[PDB]
Every structure is written in structure tokens, then in C-alpha cells.
């Protein structure tokens, strides 16, 4: 299986997700954590993905595009997590953005499981 | 626009036409055989009214049975731009309609923003304001949105928002 | 502008240019015939005099009858989405038909665009 | 200031011929342009009192109140609030029979736009 993570991704957030998702005591870790974002990755995220070769991937493109969603192939996705910014000056704008992501994804595929954040 | 049985068409009156292409319309040429009204006299006018005589509340709106009206939600604040709401109200108050055949209007928006545009609307009749936000179901049900005739939604800060995408959320 | 604004006439243009606002006036026998102009409205071919053409009437026949009877200009049709399909449904959304041909049938659930004079 | 504040009605009532108008584009934040040095040569002493050119100012009441502390002692000065761009406002002061019209710009110092200068 494989899960999809879309939203605000930055080094500390992906570190906090990875170090608690791929911990050795949790035996079942055999899922592919595909990512998704619009801007190109930079900084040490590339090296993080390089040392985490067989466990993570990455892709470029927004989540509001049905062609992009078809490209990432969520049609067989077990679930689809979402990371939401919690340091934004306006809490409501980011939360409306998360609602936008949810309606786009559910419009594309109406039966996948979503675990989103709120502010 | 559509005179009836009292106009005789003169020479070269240049009527407007609706057709598929400009070739088909060419066959037309080749034929083979008390201060109630404004000073101009086009829109209803009334004396200026203070905003405290039109500001409502939820209980006032619930008592005031409004039916066959128009609800114009507005998103905005004191720093956003202007839309020109007078330009929206103006076509709806033509002299063509009779006084009791008009359409009631309410506004569900931020009164602080609406101050900047209320100075351009006090000359019009049958206008009411309900402070609040369109997202509140209590506010929406206060104006009896079930029985409304149309529910226009606008946004004053559409252009100056920060994010390039995620517009009009 | 003269169709959708409500009025775009030399008198009002001159007054707006001179004043930048509007002023209240008084009723006179003149400048009160200015009320006589055609507005926009929608009929309902269910309980009015036009309901007898709601089964299979010709659009052009309805147009000619409306003109020769009440000078009653009709040039648009609002029709339900699944009206062509015989399967009953509860869909409310309706598309818009512009300039129907003469040989046009009439669905009994039709909403017809119109302009009407002033009384 | 109340002895000299005019309104449109009494402005239309009064008659002015061979006078000088002045437009002022300023507000509270605008710097003091200085206009006592303009009124004084007109209110000199060489010519007689009967042949003295009348002055009417068309500008913001806030700016004119700010500058009025050094001008009230000059005779035959009138003031009319409003805006200089209003056609009715200019028509009310008999531009046609006027001697000559002056235009200033109070906020010329603080405006830093490359374009729109003295628009």
C-alpha cells in the first residue's frame, strides 16, 4: 500500500512525520510515503530523501489539479494524510485552504480516507 | 426596446439583429416582393436616511417577515477596496417597476466596511442591513434565505489577497 | 448599457457629468412618459393563457401569437437538464437556450425568457 | 470662519464679476504651501479700495481652517468649500466672467511617484 501527504511540507515537519512513522518498534512500515507539493524542493530535503531511498518518493504539482492527482495515482491509495501550517499569521486562510484540498480530493475520488488537520 | 403599435418606422432606422453569422443578416437589406422620482424621472428617490434607521438585528429580521427579496452577502473589511454597491442597486430601482412591485434588499456583511459605501446609497428606498458574516447559519436563517429570490455572493478583497491560487475561498 | 443598466440616455449622461450624483425631482405630465419602456421577465406556461401550447406547440407560433396579442417579445428558453431524457428525476438545474428555431417543440416544464411593456 | 463660509445656494444668489478664484489640492497631512504672500500683493495699497479684486478659495475646509490663522485680517475675502473638479462647483462661482483662475498643489513635496505628478 501507499499513502499520500500533501500540504505545507518543510524540513522540521517532514522530520517529525518520518521519525514517528518509520520507527523500528512499529513492525508494519511497508507503505510508500509519496509526497506532493507545488514548489520545487530545496535545502536538505533532497538529501533526506536520498538517505531514505526505498521508503519515500516525491513529486511536483498542486493538489487541485485532477490530472496531477491522476499522475500520483491515488485511485488505489489506502489513505491520504495532510499536513497543515500552524505558524501562519492568519489561521482562517490556511484552514480554508485545507477545506479546498479536501473538496478537490473528494471530488476526484469519493471513497479514500482523509486525515486532515485544523487550526 | 420593443415599441408597440404606436411607432412608425422611419428611413434607415438601423435595427439591431440576432443571427448566427453576419452573412445571414445581410438578407434583411435586400428585400424582394412628494419626491418619489428622480429629477431625470427614471429611478425612485427618497429622502436621505441615517444608518441607525436601517441597521437591523437577528430578532428584528426574524420579526420582519421578508419574502421575495434579494440577499447580497459581502466579504470585506475596512482596508479592502471598493466594489461600487450603488452601481448594483441602481438597475434594480428603475421607474419601470411599480412601487409595491419592487424587490427588497438586505446585506449580510461587516458594518465597519459598509460604512465606507453607505454614503452612496441613502437616496434609495427599501434597503435594510443586517450585520454579521455570511458563514453564520443563524444569520443566514434570520433573513429567511429559504424564501429569497436570489442570493448574490461577492468579495471585496478578491484582487489584493496574498496567495496566487486559492482565490474566493 | 441601455439594456442592462436601466437607462443610458443623453439627459442622464449630461446630468451625471455635471453633478456627479443624482437629485430628487417632481412629477410632471412630461418626463413621466419616460416610464414606458420594456423590462426583463420570465413567464410560466402552466397556469397562464400560454399553457395550451405547452404540450407540443411551435416556438414560432407561440412567438407570433404573443406579438399579435400583447406585443410580447420572447427570445429565450430555460429548460431542465434531463428534460430530453424521459427518465424522471429531481434535478433542478436548468440550462439556457438562445434563439430557438421556428420548428421547436415545447416541454411542459419550460421557463421562457421575455420582455414586457409598462402599464 | 463662519462670516466667510459660503454655500452653493448663496453662492448662486450672489453676483461676482472680475474676481480671482483659487483651487487648493490639499488635506490635513499636506504641508503649508503658504498663501498670505499671495493674498498680500492683491491686497496691496497702491490701488483704491473700490478697485480691489475679490478672491474666492475652492478647497478643503480642513486645510483652509489650518491656514486661516494668518489671513483673516485681509478684507474682501470669501471662501467656498467643496472640490475644484466638480462642474457644478465651478459653475457656481461664475468662471465665465472671472478675471483669471489660479491652480496650486499643496502636497507637491510629499508625492514621490515618478508618474501621476500633477495629474
UniProtKB/Swiss-Prot annotation, chain B:
This is Calcium-activated potassium channel subunit alpha-1. Homotetramer; which constitutes the calcium-activated potassium channel. Interacts with RAB11B. Interacts with beta subunits KCNMB1, KCNMB2, KCNMB3 and KCNMB4. Interacts with gamma subunits LRRC26, LRRC38, LRRC52 and LRRC55. Beta and gamma subunits are accessory, and modulate its activity. The protein was initially thought to contain two functionally distinct parts: The core channel (from the N-terminus to the S9 segment) that mediates the channel activity, and the cytoplasmic tail (from the S9 segment to the C-terminus) that mediates the calcium sensing. The situation is however more complex, since the core channel also contains binding sites for Ca(2+) and Mg(2+). Widely expressed. Except in myocytes, it is almost ubiquitously expressed. The lineage of its organism: Eukaryota, Metazoa, Chordata, Craniata, Vertebrata. It is found in: Cell membrane. The S0 segment is essential for the modulation by the accessory beta subunits KCNMB1, KCNMB2, KCNMB3 and KCNMB4. The S4 segment, which is characterized by a series of positively charged amino acids at every third position, is part of the voltage-sensor. Phosphorylated. Phosphorylation by kinases such as PKA and/or PKG. In smooth muscles, phosphorylation affects its activity. Palmitoylation by ZDHHC22 and ZDHHC23 within the intracellular linker between the S0 and S1 transmembrane domains regulates localization to the plasma membrane. Depalmitoylated by LYPLA1 and LYPLAL1, leading to retard exit from the trans-Golgi network. It comes from Homo sapiens. The chain holds residues 646 to 941 of 1236 of the full protein. Residues 67-169 form the RCK N-terminal domain. It comes from the Eukaryota. Potassium channel activated by both membrane depolarization or increase in cytosolic Ca(2+) that mediates export of K(+). It is also activated by the concentration of cytosolic Mg(2+). Its activation dampens the excitatory events that elevate the cytosolic Ca(2+) concentration and/or depolarize the cell membrane. It therefore contributes to repolarization of the membrane potential. Belongs to the potassium channel family. Calcium-activated (TC 1.A.1.3) subfamily. KCa1.1/KCNMA1 sub-subfamily. Residues 65-85 are annotated as: Segment S9. It is linked to Paroxysmal non-kinesigenic dyskinesia 3 with or without generalized epilepsy: An autosomal dominant neurologic disorder characterized by absence seizures, generalized tonic-clonic seizures, paroxysmal nonkinesigenic dyskinesia and involuntary dystonic or choreiform movements. Onset is usually in childhood. Patients may have seizures only, dyskinesia only, or both.
Swiss-Prot record, chain D:
Residues 17-119 form the RCK N-terminal domain. Phosphorylated. Phosphorylation by kinases such as PKA and/or PKG. In smooth muscles, phosphorylation affects its activity. It is found in: Cell membrane. Residues 15-35 are annotated as: Segment S9. Widely expressed. Except in myocytes, it is almost ubiquitously expressed. It comes from the Eukaryota. The S0 segment is essential for the modulation by the accessory beta subunits KCNMB1, KCNMB2, KCNMB3 and KCNMB4. The S4 segment, which is characterized by a series of positively charged amino acids at every third position, is part of the voltage-sensor. The protein was initially thought to contain two functionally distinct parts: The core channel (from the N-terminus to the S9 segment) that mediates the channel activity, and the cytoplasmic tail (from the S9 segment to the C-terminus) that mediates the calcium sensing. The situation is however more complex, since the core channel also contains binding sites for Ca(2+) and Mg(2+). Belongs to the potassium channel family. Calcium-activated (TC 1.A.1.3) subfamily. KCa1.1/KCNMA1 sub-subfamily. It is linked to Paroxysmal non-kinesigenic dyskinesia 3 with or without generalized epilepsy: An autosomal dominant neurologic disorder characterized by absence seizures, generalized tonic-clonic seizures, paroxysmal nonkinesigenic dyskinesia and involuntary dystonic or choreiform movements. Onset is usually in childhood. Patients may have seizures only, dyskinesia only, or both. Epilepsy, idiopathic generalized 16: An autosomal dominant form of idiopathic generalized epilepsy, a disorder characterized by recurring generalized seizures in the absence of detectable brain lesions and/or metabolic abnormalities. Generalized seizures arise diffusely and simultaneously from both hemispheres of the brain. Seizure types include juvenile myoclonic seizures, absence seizures, and generalized tonic-clonic seizures. EIG16 is characterized by onset of seizures soon after birth or in the first years of life. Potassium channel activated by both membrane depolarization or increase in cytosolic Ca(2+) that mediates export of K(+). It is also activated by the concentration of cytosolic Mg(2+). Its activation dampens the excitatory events that elevate the cytosolic Ca(2+) concentration and/or depolarize the cell membrane. It therefore contributes to repolarization of the membrane potential. This is Calcium-activated potassium channel subunit alpha-1. It comes from Homo sapiens.
